Amino acid sequence: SWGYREHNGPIHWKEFFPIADGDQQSPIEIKTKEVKYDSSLRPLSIKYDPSSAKIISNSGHSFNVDFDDTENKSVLRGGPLTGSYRLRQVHLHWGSADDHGSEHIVDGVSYAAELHVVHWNSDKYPSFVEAAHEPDGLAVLGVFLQIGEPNSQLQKITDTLDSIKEKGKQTRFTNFDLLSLLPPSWDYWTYPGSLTVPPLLESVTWIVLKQPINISSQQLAKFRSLLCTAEGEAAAFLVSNHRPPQPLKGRKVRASFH
Ligand SMILES: COC(=O)c1ccc(SCc2ccccc2)c(S(N)(=O)=O)c1
Ligand SMILES: [Zn+2]
């Protein structure tokens, strides 16, 4: 089964998931001088209720903060999107080294980590699972993290990691102010792409914010202490969980700014 280790890692996913070689795969290299400013794009409009977060868990591939998506208390609107997309989950990608941890790469710069905020089109589809199978079903906001001052807005997360060390562990996680984790500028790039983990579905409108947020090296090192293995299996650590960049295949990357 899939992961980021030598025998089950990204380079081997195309052996098992046909879509891994598809024409709309993510993540990509963003070349900032080659991106097209598009005046038809709209500003992002975000409303994230701190009561929406409920549980944090170790999936074996990252931590996952799950939100109550029963109704439209937390939504993303605007940007390239038609209608309202409902907040479902947040997770993080990193590498074994602080200078090569992100999924998207900007003018050759890989950041220390990348946060993904996953949302689904509830205006058109009745659930996350159904939306995940349609070209306009999902929207993922990407936020880069760069090494710097410790981020006090990550402290709630790092405090829980000891209780979710093994794959499948979960703990209560509520009153989380996700809005305060985002950077002050909501300028972004966008393109059509895919999930960056199996099943690699081509259902994602990517919105990658230009402005990175900070994290300390100590904070980021704590994530690598999560395991990719369950209780009572031989332990292996989740030291890296990012997919390499995929061919653009004629897709247009657009910028909200110039
Ligand atoms: C190591 O990274 C991850 O674990 C991870 C987990 C879930 C999701 S999207 C939710 C999802 C996918 C598949 C099935 C159910 C939910 C993504 S992504 N990078 O495509 O935004 C990445
Ligand atoms: Zn992700």
Residue numbers in the entry: 6 to 263
From the paper:
Humans have 12 catalytically active CA isozymes (EC 4.2.1.1). − The enzyme catalyzes the reversible hydration of carbon dioxide and has many essential physiological functions. To investigate this phenomenon, we synthesized ortho-substituted benzenesulfonamides, determined their binding affinity to all catalytically active isoforms of human carbonic anhydrases, obtained crystal structures with CAII, CAIX, and CAXIII, and performed molecular docking.
Figure shows the interactions between CAII with compounds 4c and 4d, CAIX with 4d, and CAXIII with compounds 4c and 4d. Meanwhile, a hydrogen bond is formed in the active site of CAIX and CAXIII through a water molecule with Gln70 and Asn65 or Ser64 and Asn69, respectively. Asn62 in CAII, Asn65 in CAIX, and Asn69 in CAXIII differ only by the numbering but correspond to the same position. Similarly to CAIX, the docking protocol picked the docked pose with the approximately correct binding mode (with RMSDs equal to 1.90 and 0.95 Å, respectively).
